[PDB]
RNA sequence: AGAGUGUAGCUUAAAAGCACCCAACUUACACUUAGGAGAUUCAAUUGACGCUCUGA
């Protein structure tokens, strides 16, 4: 019984920056936000203000704009760093800072006698071996650079069969933690791909049942 | 010893005479009822999204498992168990800026 | 999915204002910390 | 009767395991049942330490709802003491002066008792996630004291 | 290309009973209260629009 010893290595990479707000959300928060002002009492600044002027009048008639002058101030002098990474760019799709909103996963595109497709980049196994270490090997020789997988766990994700002598397709995945790419002019095609590019990319079925178990968000 | 730290200070009790009135209207009691309504429905819907997401994860798990038991009677002794790699185990939380 | 533990509430009875300040830490990141005196800017060494 | 065949119809304390232990000081945990094809963890520790506070209780309010939906045994989630923090402030043009701040920090902590292979990664992939924006996982050990 | 099928997540139910979420109490879970969204895929026991398996 001959069985060809294949295998599989998705990437995971976590999001940097949070999904766009829409509207309703907005309104619930500003509704909450008046709840808890309705809600909150004797606050420092509400004091410092009352009574302050309180205190100004009465010596008047016989501290707090100014600190929120300079506080309005210091906020428009500081520059936060700018959101807009997904849409100044538009070209380099195989970029670790290309998308920061979602969940991105690494393919690479290998182009062999008999089949002409874009697989995932598989991983062959040893009987000698384990195969959660021939899986971290072939991740690493695959990406040479110096990155951390750690993964989630030795359990598979998805399988597969294809024969022509029969063969099977494992699938690991492994979360990334920091992107020290090396050289990232090299002839593979390794591109960071989120969700909606995945599914456009991919065509038979063999890929189509990936997009089942990642994280769509 | 656990130090409990829910009991409020002594300054919560002092001062309480500031703004005890709430006025509002039926308009803003009706648009509030309706904004309440629509989250609630978002939630759902979100919810329901996250049982499916995660019924699906779990079948395509359990194909997995067992198209592996069924090809190799031998790798699920070692794919089954976790060796021990995530007792300090980290993940903080995302940004907004990026640096 | 970062928003499902975004719209929050205090649950307490007796509780004083918590104003949206933000503060970076020492790479450069803003976040949005509900905490009194409605300053804007922490620097936090 | 006992010789009636409507014996031990009234028995109950036998589809109950509740024996009303001492659970406040037992320092009895679960150990991770190991045999290869069939895992299971113990006890973990789940930390979500952030600023603020509502942020804080909000996650755990929601991580202990879905692991309620989830089926899944829970022993007991408390919250520790908060720690004060004060942050120095230099002047600009004296760089001999030094001011002081105040900001908040909680931290929570919750606990599942079965925590299979599977079960436990799809668990800790849905909570990374939806990870909400401020707060920080980092799970630990069960032998944390306070 | 063939087969198994056919009421929302479930029914040896015929438009119901179990489920889900939000608002109030709770460190937290939970009861309770106050609310919300849900289905017989089509033309008269028949044939075809959806899912799965067996293939290439």
Redesign the pocket.
């Known amino acids: 019984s001959p069985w060809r010893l294949l295998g599989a290595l998705c990437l995971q990479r976590p999001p940097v920056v949070s999904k766009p707000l829409t509207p309703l959300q907005e309104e619930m928060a500003s509704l909450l936000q008046q709840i808890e002002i309705e809600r909150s009492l004797y606050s420092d600044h509400e004091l410092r203000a009352l009574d302050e002027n309180q205190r100004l009048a009465k010596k008047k008639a016989d501290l707090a704009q100014d600190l929120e002058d300079m506080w309005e101030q210091k906020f428009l002098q500081f520059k936060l760093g700018a959101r807009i990474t997904e849409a100044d760019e538009k070209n380099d799709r195989t970029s670790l800072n290309r998308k920061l909103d979602r969940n991105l996963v690494l393919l690479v595109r290998e182009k062999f006698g008999d089949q002409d497709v874009w697989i995932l980049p598989q991983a062959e196994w040893q009987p000698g071996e384990t195969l959660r270490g021939t899986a971290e090997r072939t991740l690493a020789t695959l990406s040479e650079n110096n990155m951390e997988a750690k993964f989630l766990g030795n359990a598979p994700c998805g399988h597969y069969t294809f024969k022509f002598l029969g063969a099977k397709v494992f699938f690991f995945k492994a979360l990334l933690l920091t992107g020290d790419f090396s050289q990232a002019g090299n002839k593979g095609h390794h591109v960071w791909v989120t969700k909606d590019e995945l599914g456009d990319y991919l065509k038979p079925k063999y890929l189509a049942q990936v997009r089942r178990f990642v994280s769509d968000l | 010893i656990p130090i409990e730290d ?1 009991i409020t200070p002594l300054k919560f009790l002092d001062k309480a005479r500031e703004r005890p009135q709430v006025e509002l209207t039926f308009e803003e009691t009706e648009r509030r009822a309706l904004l ?2 629509k ?3 978002y ?2 819907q979100e ?2 999204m996250e049982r499916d997401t995660i019924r699906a994860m779990l079948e395509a798990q359990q194909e997995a498992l067992e198209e592996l038991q069924l090809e190799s009677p031998k790798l699920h002794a070692e794919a089954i168990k976790r060796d021990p790699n995530l007792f300090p185990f980290e993940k903080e939380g995302p940004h907004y800026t990026p640096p | 999915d970062s928003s499902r533990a975004s719209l929050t ?1 205090v ?1 307490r ?1 007796a509780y004083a204002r918590l104003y949206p300040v933000l503060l970076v830490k020492q790479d450069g990141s803003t976040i949005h910390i509900r905490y009194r005196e409605p300053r804007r800017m922490l620097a936090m060494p | 009767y006992k010789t009636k065949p409507t014996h031990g119809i009234g028995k109950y304390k036998h589809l109950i395991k509740a024996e009303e232990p001492k659970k406040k000081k037992g320092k009895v945990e679960v150990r991770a049942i190991n045999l290869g094809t069939d895992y299971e963890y113990g006890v973990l520790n789940i930390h979500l330490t952030a600023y603020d506070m509502t942020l804080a ?1 909000s996650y ?2 929601y991580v ?2 879905l692991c ?2 989830l089926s899944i045994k ?1 022993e007991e ?3 520790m003491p908060t720690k004060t923090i004060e942050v120095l402030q230099l002047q600009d043009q004296g760089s001999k002066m030094l001011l002081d701040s105040v900001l908040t920090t909680h931290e929570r902590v919750v606990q599942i008792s079965g925590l299979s292979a599977t079960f436990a990664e799809i668990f800790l992939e849905i909570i990374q996630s939806s990870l909400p924006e401020g707060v920080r996982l980092s799970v630990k050990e069960h032998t944390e004291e306070d």
């Open positions: 829910f309440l309504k989250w609630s429905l939630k759902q919810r329901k | 509430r649950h009875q | 209780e755990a309010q202990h709802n309620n939906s829970v989630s408390y919250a």
